Design a protein around this ligand. Sequence first.
Ligand SMILES: [Cl-]
Ligand SMILES: [Cl-]
Lengths: 167, 168
Amino acid sequence: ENLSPEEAAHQKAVVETLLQEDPWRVAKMVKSYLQQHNIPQREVVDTTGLNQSHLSQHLNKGTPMKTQKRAALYTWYVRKQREVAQQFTHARNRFKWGPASQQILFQAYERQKNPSKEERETLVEECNRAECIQRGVSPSQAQGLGSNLVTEVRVYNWFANRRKEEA
Amino acid sequence: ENLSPEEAAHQKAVVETLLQEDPWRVAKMVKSYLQQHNIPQREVVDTTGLNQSHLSQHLNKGTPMKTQKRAALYTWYVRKQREVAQQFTHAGNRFKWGPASQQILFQAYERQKNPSKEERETLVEECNRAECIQRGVSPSQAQGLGSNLVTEVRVYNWFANRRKEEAF
DNA sequence: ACTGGTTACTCTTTAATGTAT
DNA sequence: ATACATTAAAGAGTAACCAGT
Ligand SMILES: [Cl-]
Ligand SMILES: [Cl-]
């Protein structure tokens, strides 16, 4: 179930049509995927071997890149799309706070700046379920959120740093 | 050149007096000084051996720093001020554009996006004059600017990069 | 001199960490 | 638990470089 002969040709067909498209339209399409799943650009740079500064300038600004290096970018894009779907159905990077959970954390901080462990774990289920809805997946699949899984320790680390922000 | 033994004792009292003052006030004095001379934060990290994220957060945001680390940075503040004096009295890193030179270059780009070489040297002398006035030194002394000295090559590279930014 | 593709370097930001009340 | 004190890690931004009409 890991791979199929036809879908492997479909992956090669997708990267073929993606190279034929406007590289900016694909850049916006890829940047929106990295933001929805909070996958760090370091994973892209470490896997494909591209330049961090070059890849960042291409996604956020549209800096033109040659088709040979762009092909390795689209190759990782199509493969990462399958790995994400499988890892969520079957259920190294640094944690990243999603924008959907940040709104819930700012609500709780405006209410009270020192929640109890029960209130922390309650916000964990709220933020995890929120991160799943953002990624378009079901809540029980939150175990597939991976490195971006909201934990009680991480919620406590967020509230502790936000108290330090008032100075 | 060598600091008089009496002069060195003054530096120590300056560090202790700066340690007695509020750390956020001394942080703003050092940060504004770095912005006036375009001194890279990497150079302060290399000398004082401090953490770049710690020093950046203690200067820009004013994060709590220990008295020992603040004293090591305050020791660099006083030695660099004097070293800048001899750096410029002798006149008789990487380049970093200044705010006044960036505003003048914004004027020329609005008038001519492709200036001639004659227009480049005239802008070089104007920017070097404005950068000298920023730190309160005479326009004649520019060797002390060193890495932050304006050059026609840097002006042409500034307009070429602005052309790439204008394309998007 | 020139656009165009590319990048070493810089510095802010972030989530995480260690510890003595 | 938790405010000081701290930071390894990510990433956008800057000024610059190399090639080839
Ligand atoms: Cl994910
Ligand atoms: Cl200087």
